[PDB]
Amino acid sequence: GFRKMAFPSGKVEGCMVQVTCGTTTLNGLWLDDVVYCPRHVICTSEDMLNPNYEDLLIRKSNHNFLVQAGNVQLRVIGHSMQNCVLKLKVDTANPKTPKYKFVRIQPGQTFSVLACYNGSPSGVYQCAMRPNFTIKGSFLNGSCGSVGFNIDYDCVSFCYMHHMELPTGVHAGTDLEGNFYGPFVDRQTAQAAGTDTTITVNVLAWLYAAVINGDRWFLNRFTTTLNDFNLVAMKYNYEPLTQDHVDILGPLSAQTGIAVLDMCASLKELLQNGMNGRTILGSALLEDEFTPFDVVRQC
Amino acid sequence: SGFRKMAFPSGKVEGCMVQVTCGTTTLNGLWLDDVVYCPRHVICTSEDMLNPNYEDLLIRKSNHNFLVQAGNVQLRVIGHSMQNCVLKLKVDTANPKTPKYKFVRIQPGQTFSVLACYNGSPSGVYQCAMRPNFTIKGSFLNGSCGSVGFNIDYDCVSFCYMHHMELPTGVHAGTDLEGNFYGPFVDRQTAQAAGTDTTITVNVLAWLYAAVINGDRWFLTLNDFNLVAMKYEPLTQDHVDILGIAVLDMCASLKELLQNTILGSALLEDEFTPFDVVRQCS
Ligand SMILES: *c1c([C@@H]2Oc3cc(OC)cc(O)c3C(=O)[C@H]2O)cc(O)c(O)c1O
Ligand SMILES: *c1c([C@@H]2Oc3cc(OC)cc(O)c3C(=O)[C@H]2O)cc(O)c(O)c1O
Fold first, then answer.
1. Which of A92, A186, B127, B238 is exposed most, by the fewest CB atoms within 10 A?
2. B3 in contact with chain A, both atoms CB, cutoff 8 A
3. Cα torsion angle, A136, A138, A144, A148, sign
4. SS3 per residue for B200-251
5. Which residues pair with A156 in a beta bridge?
6. Of B125, B137, B264, the CB nearest to A8
7. Measured between alpha carbons, how far is B70 from A112 in angstroms, rounded to an integer?
8. How far is Cα A160 from Cα A168, in angstroms, rounded to an integer?
9. Rounded distance, CA A262 to CA A257, Å?
10. Is A151 in CB contact (< 8 Å) with chain B?
């Protein structure tokens, strides 16, 4: 079987705290003696549209920030700002601090989200960074500060922090540097996600996973050039397939003996005919939230 | 906004996962208090997969024939016994990471989270449901025998499933934590197959309600719906009471869907219980 799997969230659960400034409360990420959270926590109801974060932060003292790790209150001894993330220095290092690093992911890459409310983890799920730099996540009010991550070798790579929900229902956030994915800004002025597309390299990887698990009904005797595939796939609103993407599919092609452009011909036919009542790995749609690395890891 | 197949945070279960080795077999074990639980098939050999005598195989083994690895530490086994299809290994050290837990047995149509582990090392977590045919459509890529399923109510972990084997149809079968199998399956490498599976109708209705909350209202009598749907499981009064837009109006929507996408899915998802919708949408 093939499941959309999230990484074990235990190493991240031990880092989620509750940050309060004024009457605003959201989640923070406690690593070493620093707590990371969205800088919009310092905004009031009149600072939602055009806040000057430099002016708002200079008016704050350390005792204006209430950091709460479970039932233990953490004393803030310093505060600074980097891009859209607020850094709260506390007098206690987190003893549960795992091996970690901050990374920025590319569109199409996947990660796991630990949805938290009031610093309390409530659920974990797997998702991908859409080509339009949005997240088709599952967030309610109080989830800002939740983080996305991958685990590579018992080291936690933090790549996402949730900041806001867009009017279309999707979500936008930053890396742990405070830099937003996409052209979005931490302001409550109407923003809209660009035109989203299907992650082509992920669908091909998912098709390779279907062959690995024993499904071959979708293959055909055809091949295609890289340009002719892109000409057809882009008409179905698929992201263009680059030569780097083809190289990434290398190991899966060798493991299955099916050339990438041969699998491209299969995908071109699947888009043309649909499923015809059949399923691939339990899905009736072409799933695009598995990277070629996710396929190899689970298989 | 949004709707995802959300699993419970797995941190409380990760601290319990250990590696159990017996002979040429290595799988996952659940370390709770001073007892490690794992499938009793761990004591089988290569030549004892078709018709093993577990009573005979266990009597011939001593405590030191079981090697339990908890991180970089080897736990010392001081006792071994069997409860149904689960082996219970008594160790000399209580697990300091033992959470508040209880062993429960779930019903078909209920959901839970699985922490898929590989030889004691956790690798991934996902959410799934107990199919009416008592099978699990999970992802178990070997070395995952002994992985457990659970739910979390308040701070209490309700262990409900332990994985034992995969069926020839790609689905998986297991037991509860007391060793009692879900479904008509035995722990032997024999000819067995999963029964005709049916769709959990009450979960589909709950999933349609989650779509109305998320902005999908384009498709917005009991006995009449059942006769058409049964052409899927039947709906009871408790189903409508648990799903308490009237329910019968939603059944007419589902009836108009079975004959003649929703939340990014071309299929009617049936692995979200009515409480899962409330837990995620509130
Ligand atoms: C608020 C939020 C998010 O705050 C927020 C701030 C902002 O600019 C200052 C713009 C937008 O769009 C948003 C949001 O979308 C809000 O979701 C999140 C959370 O969790 C809390 O508690 C809060 O008060
Ligand atoms: C074996 C297994 C599972 O062992 C197993 C035993 C059995 O009867 C004794 C029947 C079947 O069907 C199975 C399986 O399907 C195997 O998956 C699991 C794991 O993880 C290991 O390591 C192992 O040796």
1. B238
2. yes
3. negative
4. CHHHHHHHHHHHHHCCCCCCCCHHHHHHHHCCCCCCCHHHHHHCCCCHHHHH
5. A100, A151
6. B125
7. 26
8. 20
9. 10
10. no
Q: Classify residue A197 by its DSSP letter.
A: -
Cβ distance B261 to B224 under 8 Å? Answer: no
- Separation in Å, CA of B55 to nearest CA in chain A: 32
Consecutive H or E run containing A111: strand A110-117
Q: Which residue has the tokens 């206690």?
A: A92
| A122 with B9: Cβ contact below 8 A | yes
Smallest CA–CA distance, residue A166 to chain B, in Å, is 9
* Structure-token pair, residue B55: 């009573």
Superfamily of the domain at A11-90: Trypsin-like serine proteases (2.40.10.10)
Query: H-type helices in chain A, by residue range?
Result: 10-13, 53-58, 200-212, 226-233, 243-248, 250-256, 260-273, 292-298
Q: Is A188 in the pocket of ligand 1 (CB under 6 A)?
A: yes
**Taking the alpha carbons of B240, B244, B246, B247 in that order, is the dihedral positive or negative?**
negative
What method did the depositors use to determine the structure?
X-ray
The answer to whether the Cβ–Cβ distance between B4 and A125 falls below 8 Å is yes
Tokens standing for residue B141: 């890529």
Domain A200-298 has CATH 1.10.1840.10: yes
Q: Which CATH superfamily is domain B11-91 in?
A: Trypsin-like serine proteases (2.40.10.10)
How far, in Å, CA of B104 to CA of B21, rounded? 26
Fold of B201-281: main proteinase (3clpro) structure, domain 3 (1.10.1840)
Residues B112-144: b if buried by 16+ CB within 10 A, e if exposed = bbbbbbbbbbbbbbbbbbbbbbbbbbbbbbebb
Return d(Cα A108, Cα A291) in angstroms, integer: 7
Does residue A1 sit in helix, strand or coil? coil
Length of chain A: 299
In whole angstroms, give the CA distance from residue B118 to residue B140: 9
Residue at token pair 């084997």: B165
- CB of B72 less than 8 A from some CB of A: no
- Give the resolution value in Å: 2.3
What are phi and psi for residue B278, nearest 5 degrees?
-70, -35
Contact between residue B97 and residue B15 where contact means Cβ atoms under 8 Å apart: yes
Q: A2: how many CB neighbours lie within 10 A of its CB?
A: 24
User: How many Cβ contacts (< 8 angstroms) between chains A and B?
Assistant: 112
Among protein residues, the one with the nearest Cα to ligand 2's atom 13 is B165
